[PDB]
Amino acid sequence: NYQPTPEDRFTFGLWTVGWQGRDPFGDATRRALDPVESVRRLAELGAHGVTFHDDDLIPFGSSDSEREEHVKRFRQALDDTGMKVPMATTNLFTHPVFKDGGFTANDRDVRRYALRKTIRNIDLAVELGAETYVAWGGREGAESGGAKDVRDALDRMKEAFDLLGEYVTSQGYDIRFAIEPKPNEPRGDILLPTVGHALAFIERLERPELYGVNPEVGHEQMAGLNFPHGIAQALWAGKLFHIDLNGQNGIKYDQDLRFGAGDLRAAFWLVDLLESAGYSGPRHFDFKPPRTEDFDGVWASAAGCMRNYLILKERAAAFRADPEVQEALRASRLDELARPTAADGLQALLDDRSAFEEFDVDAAAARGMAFERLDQLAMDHLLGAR
Template identity: 70%
Template structure:
């Protein structure tokens, strides 16, 4: 398939690389090497690849191992023409983050989370990524009395102020995009919707550097109209990045192929993004990023067929 450069189609390594392990079943596919993912994305016509730090460099790798992996990754990017428009950090998988990263009740964990993100910002700058997404999947609780929400928001804001001050001091051309989600894996997650996140951002020191990375399924899990939410994010100048996938109503996060859920809302979203600007010009010029998961029933070939289906939508 010809590369769709103008469309800026990008995929997370964790999407096509998902081994189809879920809370009730083991993996149904083998792990994919990150370098192979880059090659295959180029083959199906994608423009960019994104990743969490641990997607590329396994957690606990030594400095020399990390350097070798990053060097090899850069070679694959150069060979394929694939770019890295966005990077994010995994602050949810390791048991140390069981109570969150930036909002953990444990001060040592909060400090470690900041160090992990700051190190990854350096990699983002090195690779030319201009957007840094922050999804606080563990920033929340299951019980109302387990975490002081006001204190947690203070800690969240302190972390964001530290990160934005860091990029300002280093003169990096990087902006941050908060990804809202109402629940899962936590019972309740802080900054659950576009509206919550926008209100939070307005209280930050460098709020011009912080916007949103809304995801179709996350807003629809809360019963909200995704197109309307995106329109408001645009109106407030806060749509820094977007995650496209499919969701069929208020249930667990399905991460279906884009359009394989609420088809009418998907059409209205595309119309807004592509023709909602002045005189019918695109209203959004950032990456069209697909954060989906191939079905557990797919084999390896099916992974790439489903990835291409997102771009055809």
């Protein structure tokens, strides 16, 4: 019955199940959770691990002794449960000092502080076993046009990521970075607003091999984009280092619904792609149990994230394995799509009369793609209506 186990690599941020329910118009509806209790409850649900921002694990402004004790208790919870910490990140968005950004703040002293804060937490992430270090620059951007020269900001962003790369290399760390795009919220427009923009930016870094993307379902959907398509481009680039899974109902504030909620068919095609491509990273949920829920509803919502992934995995696998679907894929020429256009080379193509002079465009145009039959087979598989 779609029961998750640690082998499924499901992970959750401390800040997900720990979200107290404050929104722009509302006070908290739930008490803060001790990270130790979240680690235990998530393990009981079949999670593999957790993730953290610095300030989720150690309250901002903690003394060294307080820091040591927070980490010691967390380590004990990991040891008590067998949970892992595959990813960590920095909070460069909550404190009012970051109101115009961390790495791209107009104030240079803030940019330097943001880097120091990040570096401190990279060390801790490595200590706790993380393989990936996420950077979500939620405050990088603007509400107005004069406030932020974007070329200058990208220069500062590159400078910051290059320094972080220099740092991890200098320490001999194996950890890699994953840049998380988002189009807007909390800034009017956020820099690196989509998977594409982040992929493009990485190519200008000094050591691009150290950086990939951490796409989030709802973020791409906040720009009305196709999340599976963006994931495909990230995979094509060799840059899908981590992923954030959740749900979103279209173009609006980021909802962070449990995975499977929001756009259900996009969730199906996403799981199909991740599984077909052999993505081996964490299946990480960056979601918020709605603030309508109590403590029991938090765990139900977390359980639902994993359940929905597993149902979709089953249905996508059944779709791909069905001989009738395999026939439909051939009827729609998906096999042809995967063959080179012109392995014969440019001159051969130029000399090939079947490619122009004697190409029967009308006969080709008349051939239906048979995509609707294929898609209804996909629908039938998703719904268990075969």
